[PDB]
Design a protein around this nucleic acid. Sequence first.
DNA 1: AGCGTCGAGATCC
DNA 2: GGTATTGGATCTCGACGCTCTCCC
DNA 3: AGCGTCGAGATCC
DNA 4: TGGATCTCGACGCTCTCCC
Lengths: 530, 530
Amino acid sequence: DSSPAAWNKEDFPWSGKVKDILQNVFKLEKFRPLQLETINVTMAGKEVFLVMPTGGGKSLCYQLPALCSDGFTLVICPLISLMEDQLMVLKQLGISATMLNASSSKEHVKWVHAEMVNKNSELKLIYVTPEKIAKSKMFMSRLEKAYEARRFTRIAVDEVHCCSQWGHDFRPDYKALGILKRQFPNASLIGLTATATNHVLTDAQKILCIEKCFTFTASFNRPNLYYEVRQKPSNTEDFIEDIVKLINGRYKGQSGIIYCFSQKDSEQVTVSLQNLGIHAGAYHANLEPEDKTTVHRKWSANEIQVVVATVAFGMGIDKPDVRFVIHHSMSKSMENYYQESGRAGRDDMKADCILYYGFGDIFRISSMVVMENVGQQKLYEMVSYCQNISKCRRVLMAQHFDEVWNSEACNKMCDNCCKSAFERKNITEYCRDLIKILKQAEELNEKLTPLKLIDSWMGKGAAKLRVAGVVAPTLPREDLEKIIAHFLIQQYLKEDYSFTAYATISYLKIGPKANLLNNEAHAITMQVTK
Amino acid sequence: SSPAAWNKEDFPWSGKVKDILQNVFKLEKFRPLQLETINVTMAGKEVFLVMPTGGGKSLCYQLPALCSDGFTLVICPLISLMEDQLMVLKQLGISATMLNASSSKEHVKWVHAEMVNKNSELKLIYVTPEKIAKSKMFMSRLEKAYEARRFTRIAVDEVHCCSQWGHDFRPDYKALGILKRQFPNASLIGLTATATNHVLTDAQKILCIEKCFTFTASFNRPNLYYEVRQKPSNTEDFIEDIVKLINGRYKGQSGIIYCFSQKDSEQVTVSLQNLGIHAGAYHANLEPEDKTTVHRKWSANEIQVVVATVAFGMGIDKPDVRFVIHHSMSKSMENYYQESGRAGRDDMKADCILYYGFGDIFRISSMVVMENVGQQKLYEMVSYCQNISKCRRVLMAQHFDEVWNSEACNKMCDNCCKGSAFERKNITEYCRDLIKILKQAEELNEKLTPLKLIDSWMGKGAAKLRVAGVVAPTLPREDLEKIIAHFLIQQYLKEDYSFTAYATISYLKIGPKANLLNNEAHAITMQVTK
DNA sequence: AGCGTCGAGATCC
DNA sequence: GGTATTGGATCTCGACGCTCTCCC
DNA sequence: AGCGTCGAGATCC
DNA sequence: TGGATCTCGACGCTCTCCC
Ligand SMILES: [Zn+2]
Ligand SMILES: [Zn+2]
């Protein structure tokens, strides 16, 4: 509401008590960013929404005031697994916490009810799913009794973004949760989310029936992470060898994740690494749940060095010693790449995030996201991040997050910052040639895939598609691909999707801004290295 | 920028429209806004039509299908609505088909073959939004048909399903934008019975349309007679009033009695049957065969009265429903309008009679405690009930935000039929007495139900709950209940919900505006007759 | 656990 | 010398059945 | 319609 | 004057994840 900075203090009456617990129960010397501000706000009896990247320590901001308080804290969690994660951490720490779920043993629930009402119960955190609030009259009655007895005074709503349709995940159950603030007004409410917008947070505030809400957003920045973008090799076996050279080289004996675009990609990459002596395991949704759990367990135990995964991997990733995250293919958006890379270096020590940029991955992902209304837009933002050879990776991420950034805050931690040595290349004539090829194709009633267009540029492919006088520059194929990608994201070329029986395919067509080429003073410049 | 401009028949298609209408559909005239929507659609321009159920929505997209060359794609969330449209269209002889989740595989090949076929007589294809989202084959066949200029019309039923804030929310609808992106030259019509400004803007966003005509039909149904009656305290007396209605003015006429709860429907059905009425109970807990049998007996007029919860309402096309009686008030104005509007679909005169009971307020209030706006729409319904002067159509118009003329009702509601003859009564001292009773209860640590409050007011009930000097006025119990209801919806008294093992119950407590009584000049007035 | 209902048992006139 | 209901209403208590509520 | 191996098919030696 | 491996072309099931 006003500012998080006002709360980054320890002159509050409980502030000493906050600190005993921080160092004593939780055994942490210092507070992670925005943890102290959120905890102080909660202890002041003030509803707070905390947006914080996964692995930044969200759970602490509601777990610590629970031992600072008197009775128990009610946490609403959408999935049973997240509740199990928190419960495991808490049992290890020694805090008494319990969980109620849809099909829990009948007598576990009777015990939970008795503990809720109990006058001197040691139970400190109760985790429930949203239907326990929505549909269980007994649990609501016990919550009301506990509240009247001043043993229930804190509410934590995990995945608050689930209130809004505009959030990635939406749970209908969530539209009940407002009853909490209505039934227990003296209980302070905290909403926790990794990803949220102003619209999503305002929606959640509407659903939760909250009048005034502090809104604290943590920085995207992870200072220990080194961000790099490399050329994706044309040869798949050459790419696998480069990966093995990295793993046996910099990352010998170090755990890591390789993110892959497709399930077949994950399986093939895992097979290739296994045949080259790397202990790697594939993870994707089509795997059996037992197989998934086995792979996760072996990786966490370090029996498996590398987990080759799609976006399916992401269940409770708490591994702190992930030294490298490699993207075999680019993610579909800046959000996804940020979340996937951020699984590295949770221990706050140095870790590397290495991304492989390939021309064809753009169109794999574009055909893929054709159903998402903004899928092409976020994909093209990812593409622009990949195309950049001058700007700092942290600066681009900050633009993406609408976050205030300092140019010199990257501080040697990305590949562009460690290399001016670049120059500008005029590529207008390449655009005119490509448009000529496209026009020849459309007169012959031919649709051109990016491969057909680039081949016609290079003089290969079907002869009829070739244009007289069009000679490609003497550049590596990747340079021609980068030029075409720039024309695409700059809208001189556009994607035209076609739906066929087994697949969705991308064609390239004349873009909106191509008419600008009618004027010869028109110029198009791309940065290259010199 | 307004439909009246489109209320013409000088367009080139206007001849084809009217011939086809009178010939294929055998209807001489159009209901309001049908030709206008048809003209805008026929002008190849996406239009959103908000029109009440039973007003003839399906025709506005079915008629231009036969005016055009190839076929129209209709998007329908539920299979049942699709069956309804298919039976009407088959009876007329128009070839329309439906593809659904579990359709025969050979039905799918026949549908695909018809889609590609060049001279197919198929005019309307009904599919669910997942058919678009997940079927690569259906999209390929749609693209082939579209390129052949045989697929040029899209109808999206229940566009309000795009928004979470809509009455019904479907996640599948967020794929539907692909249609406009893949088939921009295909005209889109969106159909909905219920929508707000928020919902239409959300749906327009989701469907990726940046330009939309918006035609909203009037709520008004001139043939319907709207009445509100006092719900008798005695259940057997209430059943007698109903039998007097049914055997009297509605002898041999079909009708619906809407009930709050499923056993209420059951009790009322038993009572009507034992008194010689052919009545049938309808609620969600019935077996599907029972539902269809009851619907069939009612449609054949073998069952005169259908005693139903809100479950009845599926595809109600019975045109000769002469009376709809509300045994209990609906939970909202929206619901009461939809439930009453099933009467007089034949456009002949019909009656909507509502029975208002003090205890129904709290029955419904406890039921909707989980709905974030449930109490608010219930209280709006209550205010409609409390009114004894204003025209019912005016109250509905306020709910619908529709411009209305007071005298357009034309003797067609109970309040309009009594004509001033009303006056204002100052009831402030009653509020002070009730607040004293409430203060004594909260100091004695006692919770008061509305019945307990009325008993203390009347000098009955527990002696300890009574306040010295508080004597209730010599009025019928209904009048004290109405005074308390006025205090409640005016928020001088408030509901306090308590959750117990078997039920959620309402207490009455001092409301937010009670501090206003501190001014001694403060007055609270309720309208009465002289 | 709690509301709403209804006799028994007091008190009075 | 002492005086106030083989009754007739009335509080005024305390036990004692339901509770389970729409819609997908 | 599309990418990639793999036959078919040449002319030349 | 026969058949070489090296260019095409063909059309197959396609190659897209999980929220
Ligand atoms: Zn940098
Ligand atoms: Zn009227």
